[PDB]
Amino acid sequence: RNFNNLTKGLCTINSWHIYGKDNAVRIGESSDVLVTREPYVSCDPDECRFYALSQGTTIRGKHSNGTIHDRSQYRALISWPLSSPPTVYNSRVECIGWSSTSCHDGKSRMSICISGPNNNASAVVWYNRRPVAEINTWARNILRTQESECVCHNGVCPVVFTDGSATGPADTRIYYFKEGKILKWESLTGTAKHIEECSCYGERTGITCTCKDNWQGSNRPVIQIDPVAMTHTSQYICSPVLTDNPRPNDPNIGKCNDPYPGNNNNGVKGFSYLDGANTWLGRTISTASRSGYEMLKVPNALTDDRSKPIQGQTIVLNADWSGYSGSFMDYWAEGDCYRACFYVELIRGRPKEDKVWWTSNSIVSMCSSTEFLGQWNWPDGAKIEYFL
Amino acid sequence: RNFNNLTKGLCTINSWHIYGKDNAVRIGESSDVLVTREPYVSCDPDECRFYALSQGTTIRGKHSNGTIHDRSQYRALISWPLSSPPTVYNSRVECIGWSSTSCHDGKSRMSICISGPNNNASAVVWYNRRPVAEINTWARNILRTQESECVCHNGVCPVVFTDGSATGPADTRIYYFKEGKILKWESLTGTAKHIEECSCYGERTGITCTCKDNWQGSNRPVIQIDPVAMTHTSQYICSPVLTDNPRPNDPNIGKCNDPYPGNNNNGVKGFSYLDGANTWLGRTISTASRSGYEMLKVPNALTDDRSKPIQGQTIVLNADWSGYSGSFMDYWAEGDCYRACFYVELIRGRPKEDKVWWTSNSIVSMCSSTEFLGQWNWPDGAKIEYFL
Amino acid sequence: RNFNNLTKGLCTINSWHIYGKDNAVRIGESSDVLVTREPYVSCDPDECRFYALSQGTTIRGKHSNGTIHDRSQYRALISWPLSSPPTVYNSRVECIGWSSTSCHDGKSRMSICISGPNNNASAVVWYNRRPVAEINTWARNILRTQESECVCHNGVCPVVFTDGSATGPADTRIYYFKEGKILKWESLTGTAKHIEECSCYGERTGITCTCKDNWQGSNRPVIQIDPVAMTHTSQYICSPVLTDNPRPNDPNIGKCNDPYPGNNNNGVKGFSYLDGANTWLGRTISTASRSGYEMLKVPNALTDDRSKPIQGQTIVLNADWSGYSGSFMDYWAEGDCYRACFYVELIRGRPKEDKVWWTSNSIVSMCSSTEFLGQWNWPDGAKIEYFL
Amino acid sequence: RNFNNLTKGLCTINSWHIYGKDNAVRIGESSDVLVTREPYVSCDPDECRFYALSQGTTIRGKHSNGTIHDRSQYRALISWPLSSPPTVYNSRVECIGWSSTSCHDGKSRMSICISGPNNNASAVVWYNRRPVAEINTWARNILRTQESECVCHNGVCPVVFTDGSATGPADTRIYYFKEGKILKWESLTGTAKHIEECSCYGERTGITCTCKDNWQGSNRPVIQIDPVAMTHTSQYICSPVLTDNPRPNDPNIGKCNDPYPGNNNNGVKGFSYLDGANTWLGRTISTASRSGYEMLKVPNALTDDRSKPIQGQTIVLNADWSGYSGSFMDYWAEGDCYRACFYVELIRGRPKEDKVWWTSNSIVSMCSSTEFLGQWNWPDGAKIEYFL
Numbered sequence A, B, C, D: 001r002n003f004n005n006l007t008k009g010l011c012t013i014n015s016w017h018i019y020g021k022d023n024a025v026r027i028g029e030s031s032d033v034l035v036t037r038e039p040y041v042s043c044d045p046d047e048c049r050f051y052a053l054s055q056g057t058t059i060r061g062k063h064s065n066g067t068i069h070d071r072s073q074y075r076a077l078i079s080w081p082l083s084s085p086p087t088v089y090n091s092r093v094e095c096i097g098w099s100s101t102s103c104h105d106g107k108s109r110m111s112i113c114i115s116g117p118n119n120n121a122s123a124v125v126w127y128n129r130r131p132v133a134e135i136n137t138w139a140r141n142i143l144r145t146q147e148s149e150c151v152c153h154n155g156v157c158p159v160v161f162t163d164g165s166a167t168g169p170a171d172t173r174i175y176y177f178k179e180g181k182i183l184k185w186e187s188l189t190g191t192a193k194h195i196e197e198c199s200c201y202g203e204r205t206g207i208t209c210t211c212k213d214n215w216q217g218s219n220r221p222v223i224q225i226d227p228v229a230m231t232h233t234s235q236y237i238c239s240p241v242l243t244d245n246p247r248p249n250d251p252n253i254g255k256c257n258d259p260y261p262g263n264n265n266n267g268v269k270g271f272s273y274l275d276g277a278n279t280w281l282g283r284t285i286s287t288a289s290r291s292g293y294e295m296l297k298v299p300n301a302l303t304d305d306r307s308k309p310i311q312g313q314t315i316v317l318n319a320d321w322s323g324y325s326g327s328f329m330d331y332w333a334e335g336d337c338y339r340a341c342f343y344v345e346l347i348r349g350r351p352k353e354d355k356v357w358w359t360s361n362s363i364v365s366m367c368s369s370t371e372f373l374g375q376w377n378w379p380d381g382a383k384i385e386y387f388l
């Protein structure tokens, strides 16, 4: 086997087709399905799999009570076959913790899990299913990472971490791993003022990450990483099509180098594909809550502070709950281009649906098509009343 | 690995032997068995598997309520080991949607799933477990396909699709795929007046598909495909032994080039093996409903408008519910001929058994023998009262 | 891979050690464990597995009601990993039917299942997981076979079948298969007067089968098969240590060429290892019912009509229910001799325990040791009251 | 494949990072999780797995009643994927019995299980999943072994056994196996006065086992084995940091060649890594009961009868139940040193929590880091009240 190199550009995105859906909450009403949150998708050279942070209990289990909680000792990164639900009997534990990332370099997979109390957390870096390196908290305030896949080029896999405040300046670092070992790390540079939960993808231009500014911004910060030089830049998506949640209404001028104001101390993990005229942004439909999901074609969104949509696709109706979203691609597929993909976490239960005492989710996932395909909408599909 | 070529003729069919049976509804009374419908069987070079459209819930799950419904966002094509039931923990998701086909070309498997609303559905073509090509609705009226396996020759795998009315003229296309890519498509030609849910098999003569005319015909339309020239013809089975359901009683003269009249706007997926004196037709025993199943040896049924049975075998008693049926063969078996096989979907629940709120099925499957074997009958075997 | 040849003798049997136990009924009180009966064990070159006839329902399932029944359409030969229980999710279906045998020839496995009504049953012979040959009933009276593993030599795998009365002269045939194809069959010859449910093993001397005379005999008939010449002989175990059940008390003179009288029209499947001074016989402890199990070292039991035990080992206490027993060996193990093994079916439920409405079993299995090991006893271990 | 050789030293231990955790009791509240106890971890060259003695019932099953019991016929050594729980459907049975050890030699795995009544127990030695050798009880008083992994060097795998009194002098033997065959055994020599449940690890210096003195000692006996010469020595950990449970308070002078007095006829399985200045000892926090767990860096603990801690790490709070602990390492990992690892059994249920009628456990496991990582604590996490 050889390390994968990012040699292709993105395929032209003319619409999005259904890729995967697990219906986990529906099935888990009467099956041993693990409670999860913070899911994602990631491919090996021979298989693509769903990933998430388990809560170490099934949904029907009495221990599902209290699973709105983010960081217990009972959480772990698990993976399971594409579009199956995460069950006790089919889920493979990648590592133990409450914040994660994972990616295949073409030879083996690296998985990283962070665990610990708020003031003493640590990352353990796994490679080829063995622990290889460890990183202690540097700011003693909830060391945390992407919650979606990382990306590798010639064996080098950059990962974005943040340690420090969620409501003020924090200490973000970009680490560069190879075979699980730390080659290098660097402090965040550029104009992004706060970074969490980066969603990344790679193509010949390098690695592009769309993150969340939890502190002041409702536009999304972007980190662009050169995995050969092992350097990066940062800014915000310039477009006035704002993509965090909650967020203000879309203005006519966005902000390239500072947070667009209106909403503070909150946000949701999200993503974009930034590719000139082939640029597509994901966002919740609601400006107030994690409901609905849509894709919008916004030419040169990264650099054009006046850019507006010229095409779109609804993925989840505003009437239905969404959640985290992130990017991944099958780097090992046939063809001359990388097909952009994404997932949307469909959160069920607390805090929005409090008649149950649990919080979980299911997954829907799409990839791009060069056809202009008809659109459907893709709800979680479970009926909360059944769980009462 | 090499692409499979259709180099053999059918084995002589002198009776049918039991091949597989999953007892899914019996087992699912107390196990995490997924609700399904529209099942089939399909072989890889090293394994044969059961396939069906899941409803994204188990039978005992409260979400089984309402599963008479055909086209939700919670459906997916799944496969699972031969004669096991389709469980949450053993079912592999092939693609997402509510109409499907799948076949192995000798190197890898192609699976196709259609999803979307009635006026905006699309097919996604998967090859070697990756999405490769997409096809948008062309008539904006429930794009739909075979619901049983396709067949390949030297890498070319033809598939029959229909888009348009179920009760009048529609737009049927035959697509020719290789490695998931579209080589060619053509509009239906010939004398078949309406085409749905083709059941196909291949042999040195080419690929033969027996379909359903939902509009006016109670004889079955046939499409004969040359996978090298990538062309086809169509007509009806000439025999007065009528094989759709519901249907009129058998006359003494059938119809080769037009629907045999009596029953409109309904039908059931079915199959036949058309092979001169070695011809066998499948049909429900009842002329009114999906109950019973029998095989009848009807020499030259395809071409002889006076042909009658000279031998038969009961598969399911008229007292027991049947459903969809279709053809498949193990193209990778040893020997000098292809052994004809088929499955019968045994539907339980709604609309016929409405004391439960779900609709599901189990599978029974037979293959041909050159012996004249004794016959049994093969009911689903579940007791509805247990589910109350 | 090469066909296995029977080149070794039996290891010296000085005691029996625990080999496997699945505790199926205990576990099935609260797990999706299939109802079974007629179990056995059989090895591949890389794995040994448990086998049994499923009843197509779990024990806790309402369809377990009535499973005392022997021959429904819902039965199948299944296999599952050594010492695990037969669950819905881990059981592999080998073929469909209500009487079976199976064996690996060193290259692939042959499995045979019989299905059908009493007057029209048929065997389907599977090889490398595909149906290859079929055999119709020849006496129209419950065609039936070994219910434990067959044995192969240089690709030839003999199997004993019986068709006809259980209470009078019947038509027994020995079939010789290779790669699933019928090389030859012959009618039973020799002095055995009735043959059912042969338990076989192989060693350089040939293949030895210990069967059951259901009609008149409480001594066991023996069939000795030469798999090269494809011929056989038959007689009874000469020893007055009688090993059927029910049976009379042990006399001082046995019978070599006729049934030992006292009990008619009943019996249980059993086994022996007939090897001169290294001869060991299995039997129930009770003479009246299927309870208890013991091994007895009876020198030259096959040929000596005065032979008595000189050593023994209790396997299951008389206070505990037993059932069918049979022979198997790991033909692919290291060493200079074949280690004799056996299983005992531990039947729970009806008819002996009628407070439940089901009949099932678990498995215990032992192999021989050249040590003189201490003995334990091995009950099923389930408490019937828990199922009420 | 080649036999593994112990060619590396221990990595420098500066802290411990989370390695695995299965949350078995939490998950088993509503899933088919087997009741276990006496767990451990052991690696193959391509995978690391959890191991334990099943009780042949699930936790929610009614047969969980009475599982405080140590030695029934329903116990077996099982293994399952790292950090998954031991379920009916994912657990692989290694052998049958109520005391075990297991280890991979680089080519295949040896597993040993002891079964039988107290006065007639026997060990069966399995190699590459086949029984190879058997050992009868030599003292007729509960033949018993390590309850954690053994260690191999160039194909030779030493194992420590004890037969005889738990409250007085007993007969301990060290066996040396290769490919499951007995090369040699020897009686215990040295100054250890009672030996049970050795926890072993290997490094270039040889194989080091830390055991339990059940009779008089609250310091732990140590056996040091040369797997080439096949000889051993024994003594106690000299340190006054006492590590058995229950135990007296730590004095200022320990004992090298005799039991440190204060607590008789009890103890718990435990471990240490004895490596000069890189020495770390594990122990329960409580001196009275199996609660809490901590690691303490105690330079030259083995040889220095005045040695005290200079660093530590809490693993389980004193408020939480612990249990058995033992050593293992991934001998097949990359790098220039072997990374020390350990597991802690977290016992739930009886005798400490008697509102339930069962006894089971979950597992937490850590490995060493050369970083000085922040510490968390790792409770079982189940709420007993949920099981009522």
Ligand SMILES: *[C@@H]1O[C@H](CO)[C@@H](O[C@@H]2O[C@H](CO)[C@@H](O[C@@H]3O[C@H](CO[C@H]4O[C@H](CO[C@H]5O[C@H](CO)[C@@H](O)[C@H](O)[C@@H]5O)[C@@H](O)[C@H](O[C@H]5O[C@H](CO)[C@@H](O)[C@H](O)[C@@H]5O)[C@@H]4O)[C@@H](O)[C@H](O[C@H]4O[C@H](CO)[C@@H](O)[C@H](O)[C@@H]4O[C@H]4O[C@H](CO)[C@@H](O)[C@H](O)[C@@H]4O[C@H]4O[C@H](CO)[C@@H](O)[C@H](O)[C@@H]4O)[C@@H]3O)[C@H](O)[C@H]2NC(C)=O)[C@H](O)[C@H]1NC(C)=O
Binding pocket: A240, A241, A248, A249, A250, A285, A286, A287, A294, A295, A296, A308, A309, A310, A311, A312, A313, A372, A373, A374, A375, B119, B120
């Ligand atoms: C079968 O399936 C197919 C395929 O899915 C379906 O076809 C799809 O239909 C959907 C729904 O209509 C389309 O999505 C929308 O796309 C429009 C963009 O396209 C329009 O505008 C284009 C740009 O026009 C401008 O520039 C051009 C030059 O570049 C200039 O020519 C023009 O004059 C103008 O200046 C047009 O080019 C385009 O026309 C083309 O396409 C037409 C088909 O759509 C075709 O008929 C034409 O002939 C031509 O070919 C077209 O006019 C997006 O604007 C829109 O997204 C907005 O609206 C949705 C609600 O629907 C909202 O959720 C979005 O967030 C967004 O609106 C918010 O943001 C805006 C930007 O800031 C803001 O201005 C809005 O006020 C609004 O803001 C408010 O809400 C948000 C969200 O809550 C909040 O954050 C804000 O604060 C604020 O409160 C949709 O994405 C697909 O493109 C279309 N696909 C295709 C291939 O056709 C088909 O319908 C299905 N068939 C059936 C029968 O069902």
Ligand SMILES: *[C@@H]1O[C@H](CO)[C@@H](O[C@@H]2O[C@H](CO)[C@@H](O[C@@H]3O[C@H](CO[C@H]4O[C@H](CO[C@H]5O[C@H](CO)[C@@H](O)[C@H](O)[C@@H]5O)[C@@H](O)[C@H](O[C@H]5O[C@H](CO)[C@@H](O)[C@H](O)[C@@H]5O)[C@@H]4O)[C@@H](O)[C@H](O[C@H]4O[C@H](CO)[C@@H](O)[C@H](O)[C@@H]4O[C@H]4O[C@H](CO)[C@@H](O)[C@H](O)[C@@H]4O[C@H]4O[C@H](CO)[C@@H](O)[C@H](O)[C@@H]4O)[C@@H]3O)[C@H](O)[C@H]2NC(C)=O)[C@H](O)[C@H]1NC(C)=O
Binding pocket: B240, B241, B248, B249, B250, B285, B286, B287, B294, B295, B296, B308, B309, B310, B311, B312, B313, B372, B373, B374, B375, C119, C120
């Ligand atoms: C152990 O197992 C074995 C193996 O399974 C069992 O043996 C099997 O037994 C079954 C049941 O009897 C047989 O199935 C039937 O086969 C007949 C066809 O065979 C008969 O007819 C042949 C043709 O005769 C004609 O042509 C020849 C020349 O070609 C000429 O010589 C003759 O005079 C006549 O002109 C005969 O050749 C054949 O004889 C041969 O075989 C005999 C054994 O069967 C043997 O004894 C002879 O010596 C000779 O060797 C034989 O006479 C099918 O016709 C029949 O199917 C019809 O009937 C069933 C109900 O039973 C029905 O469900 C079918 O749909 C069908 O009838 C409907 O359709 C007809 C065609 O349109 C129509 O005419 C009918 O009126 C009827 O239509 C009505 O119902 C349908 C359905 O609801 C509806 O749609 C219509 O609208 C309308 O309402 C069976 O398939 C097996 O062939 C046979 N197998 C073997 C190898 O023997 C054995 O019984 C078991 N043993 C025990 C103890 O149980």
Ligand SMILES: *[C@@H]1O[C@H](CO)[C@@H](O[C@@H]2O[C@H](CO)[C@@H](O[C@@H]3O[C@H](CO[C@H]4O[C@H](CO[C@H]5O[C@H](CO)[C@@H](O)[C@H](O)[C@@H]5O)[C@@H](O)[C@H](O[C@H]5O[C@H](CO)[C@@H](O)[C@H](O)[C@@H]5O)[C@@H]4O)[C@@H](O)[C@H](O[C@H]4O[C@H](CO)[C@@H](O)[C@H](O)[C@@H]4O[C@H]4O[C@H](CO)[C@@H](O)[C@H](O)[C@@H]4O[C@H]4O[C@H](CO)[C@@H](O)[C@H](O)[C@@H]4O)[C@@H]3O)[C@H](O)[C@H]2NC(C)=O)[C@H](O)[C@H]1NC(C)=O
Binding pocket: C240, C241, C248, C249, C250, C285, C286, C287, C294, C295, C296, C308, C309, C310, C311, C312, C313, C372, C373, C374, C375, D119, D120
């Ligand atoms: C730890 O574990 C170890 C290992 O398991 C335990 O040791 C084992 O202990 C068991 C139980 O005692 C033994 O099983 C029994 O073996 C005897 C056979 O051995 C005895 O007889 C031998 C033959 O003697 C005759 O011939 C020799 C010459 O060949 C001659 O010298 C002698 O005078 C006589 O003529 C002796 O050689 C042998 O002695 C040797 O071994 C001794 C140890 O056992 C040792 O101490 C001596 O020094 C010497 O080395 C010994 O005396 C079997 O006969 C017996 O089986 C019968 O009894 C059981 C009930 O216990 C019954 O279930 C069996 O079916 C059978 O009896 C039925 O069938 C008979 C034959 O027809 C019939 O005659 C009986 O009347 C009876 O029939 C009735 O019941 C049946 C069944 O329901 C029914 O069908 C009939 O119709 C009728 O109603 C046992 O198998 C093991 O051999 C022994 N193993 C070893 C290695 O030692 C140890 O006990 C454990 N330790 C502890 C502390 O628990």
Ligand SMILES: *[C@@H]1O[C@H](CO)[C@@H](O[C@@H]2O[C@H](CO)[C@@H](O[C@@H]3O[C@H](CO[C@H]4O[C@H](CO[C@H]5O[C@H](CO)[C@@H](O)[C@H](O)[C@@H]5O)[C@@H](O)[C@H](O[C@H]5O[C@H](CO)[C@@H](O)[C@H](O)[C@@H]5O)[C@@H]4O)[C@@H](O)[C@H](O[C@H]4O[C@H](CO)[C@@H](O)[C@H](O)[C@@H]4O[C@H]4O[C@H](CO)[C@@H](O)[C@H](O)[C@@H]4O[C@H]4O[C@H](CO)[C@@H](O)[C@H](O)[C@@H]4O)[C@@H]3O)[C@H](O)[C@H]2NC(C)=O)[C@H](O)[C@H]1NC(C)=O
Binding pocket: A119, A120, D240, D241, D248, D249, D250, D285, D286, D287, D294, D295, D296, D308, D309, D310, D311, D312, D313, D372, D373, D374, D375
């Ligand atoms: C984020 O995470 C990090 C990493 O985990 C956290 O940092 C960790 O903090 C923990 C908790 O404090 C530390 O564990 C303790 O370690 C001490 C040992 O270190 C101390 O002592 C060292 C030795 O000093 C002696 O020798 C040196 C020369 O060698 C000499 O200089 C000195 O004067 C003295 O003579 C010191 O070197 C060391 O200082 C160094 O480290 C400091 C940081 O810790 C640093 O600040 C200094 O600058 C310097 O660098 C330090 O002083 C262990 O002694 C202790 O274990 C005892 O106490 C715990 C309870 O806390 C108890 O459970 C243990 O069993 C043990 O005490 C029992 O046994 C003793 C031995 O017999 C006995 O004497 C005690 O009385 C007691 O016995 C009683 O209880 C037991 C148990 O029930 C019973 O059996 C007996 O019978 C009896 O009843 C802890 O292990 C970590 O080392 C530390 N790690 C690191 C890398 O810093 C950090 O806190 C977290 N941050 C936050 C914000 O939460």
Ligand SMILES: CC(=O)N[C@H]1[C@H]([C@H](O)[C@H](O)CO)OC(C(=O)O)=C[C@@H]1NC(=N)N
Binding pocket: B038, B053, B070, B071, B098, B099, B100, B142, B143, B144, B147, B165, B166, B196, B214, B267, B268
């Ligand atoms: C695409 C679709 O919904 N196909 C239907 C099909 C269809 O309604 C009729 O053929 C008429 O066109 O009939 C029914 C049926 O059992 O009659 C099953 C199919 N259900 C599914 N494939 N999901």
Ligand SMILES: CC(=O)N[C@H]1[C@H]([C@H](O)[C@H](O)CO)OC(C(=O)O)=C[C@@H]1NC(=N)N
Binding pocket: C038, C053, C070, C071, C098, C099, C100, C142, C143, C144, C147, C165, C166, C196, C214, C267, C268
């Ligand atoms: C084919 C068949 O039904 N075989 C029977 C067998 C049979 O009734 C007797 O041997 C008499 O002929 O006995 C019973 C039995 O436990 O006595 C089990 C077998 N059940 C099954 N194999 N399913």
Ligand SMILES: CC(=O)N[C@H]1[C@H]([C@H](O)[C@H](O)CO)OC(C(=O)O)=C[C@@H]1NC(=N)N
Binding pocket: D038, D053, D070, D071, D098, D099, D100, D142, D143, D144, D147, D165, D166, D196, D214, D267, D268
């Ligand atoms: C063979 C056996 O029963 N070993 C016991 C062990 C033993 O009783 C003591 O060490 C005294 O000798 O203690 C207990 C224990 O938790 O204290 C667990 C072990 N249970 C099992 N291994 N099943």
Ligand SMILES: [Ca+2]
Binding pocket: A212, A213, A214, A215, A216, A217, A218, A244, A245, A263, A265, A266, A267, A268
């Ligand atoms: Ca924000």
Ligand SMILES: [Ca+2]
Binding pocket: B212, B213, B214, B215, B216, B217, B218, B244, B245, B263, B265, B266, B267, B268
């Ligand atoms: Ca019709």
Ligand SMILES: [Ca+2]
Binding pocket: C212, C213, C214, C215, C216, C217, C218, C244, C245, C263, C265, C266, C267, C268
């Ligand atoms: Ca008899």
Ligand SMILES: [Ca+2]
Binding pocket: D212, D213, D214, D215, D216, D217, D218, D244, D245, D263, D265, D266, D267, D268
């Ligand atoms: Ca002690």
